[PDB]
Paper text:
NSTs provide an additional essential role of transporting the nucleotide monophosphate (NMP) byproduct of the glycosyltransferase reaction back to the cytoplasm where it can be recycled. The structure of mCST consists of a 10-TM bundle.
We initially obtained crystals of full-length mCST in complex with [name] using the hanging-drop vapor diffusion (HDVD) method, which diffracted anisotropically to a moderate resolution (3.4 × 3.4 × 4.6 Å). A model based on this map showed that the entire 20-residue C-terminus was disordered. The HDVD and LCP structures were overall very similar, despite having very different crystal lattices. This indicates that the crystal packing interactions had no impact on the overall conformation of mCST. ¶The refinement statistics in this column represent the model from the LCP mCST∆C-[name] crystal being refined against the native HDVD mCST-[name] dataset. We observe several intra-membrane interactions between mCST molecules in our various crystal lattices.
Residue numbers in the entry: 15 to 163, 168 to 317
The structure:
């Protein structure tokens, strides 16, 4: 379920976002959407904490001791929420200035950056063979994702600067969260709550600084339609399900699993719905399979 959710969210999110940034008459503030995602992800996570603890007495006790009463953990988790506030704003900026396929292939440069950050920050080791598989995975998804390289005027060079920042944020913020998540027995849903508390403050401050002038003229929830709330739900679910992947695997295996699921989803579409496929897909799919094989070998 959590692999078929991640693909159908991955498919739906970037297309629905790209649509809502280009086609609107009354256009919404992207900074607010990033902030509202952190609010919803907090409220779902608070819900999940009650379900995990499985008791009102245990839930309340967890909020006191672990959520609100672990200040140094909130201090640590304020760092990646500041970086994710950058990242997610750069993602709305990138999809406003570049094509959906162009964003997709370019943003996979996070996979090398995330692998480097994993080796740097978590003090792990990747062999020469494992490094070969990471770049081969990156080249494999490039071949699978490839598509030709809006009703509004755009700026590609500003769009690529945004993906350059967002790629660096993806590696740093994700691995920082993994570092803090796996440093104790504290629950995933506490760590998410601890993070999204600071996130809501940082993202709301971002909105003030970026769009506060224009928001006074128009309103905070200006341009919001049924499709903007759809995008934010997908961003919230995706955000939560990403933290679950990092919990049960790691920030490198997030990339391999994401790539493997794109190939499995396209193969499911060929068999069930008679989808026509390219030779680039066939070659790229094999590279994704070899990369998983090479990464999955003992040294
Ligand atoms: N603990 C975490 C870790 C990541 N996330 C979200 O998951 C996304 C990570 O995207 P990447 O996998 O592209 O780095 C970000 O939008 C981030 O806000 C989250 O909501 N909670």
């Amino acid at each position: 379920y959590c692999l078929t959710v991640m693909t159908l969210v991955a498919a739906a999110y970037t297309v629905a976002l790209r649509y809502t940034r280009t086609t609107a008459e009354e256009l919404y503030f992207s900074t607010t959407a990033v902030c509202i995602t952190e609010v919803i992800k907090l409220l779902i996570s608070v819900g999940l904490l009650a379900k995990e603890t499985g008791s009102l007495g245990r839930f309340k006790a967890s909020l006191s001791e672990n959520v609100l009463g672990s200040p140094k953990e909130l201090a640590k988790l304020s760092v990646p929420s500041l970086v994710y506030a950058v990242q997610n704003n750069m993602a709305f900026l990138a999809l406003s200035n570049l094509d959906a396929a162009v964003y997709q292939v370019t943003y996979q440069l996070k996979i090398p950056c995330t692998a480097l950050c994993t080796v740097l920050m978590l003090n792990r080791t990747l062999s020469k063979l494992q490094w070969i598989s990471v770049f081969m995975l990156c080249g494999g998804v490039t071949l699978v994702q490839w598509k030709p390289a809006v009703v509004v005027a755009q700026n590609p060079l500003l769009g690529f600067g945004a993906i350059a920042i967002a790629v660096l944020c993806s590696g740093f913020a994700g691995v920082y969260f993994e570092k803090v998540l796996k440093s104790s027995d504290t629950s995933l849903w506490v760590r998410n709550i601890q993070m999204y508390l600071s996130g809501i403050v940082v993202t709301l401050a971002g909105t003030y600084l970026s769009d506060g002038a224009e928001i006074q003229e128009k309103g905070f929830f200006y341009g919001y339609t049924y499709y903007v709330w759809f995008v934010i739900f997908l961003a919230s679910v995706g955000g939560l399900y990403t933290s679950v992947v990092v919990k049960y695997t790691d920030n490198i295996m997030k990339g391999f699993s994401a790539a493997a699921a794109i190939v499995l989803s396209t193969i499911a579409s060929v068999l069930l719905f008679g989808l026509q496929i390219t030779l680039s897909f066939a070659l790229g799919a094999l590279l994704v399979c070899v990369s998983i094989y090479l990464y999955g070998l003992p040294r």
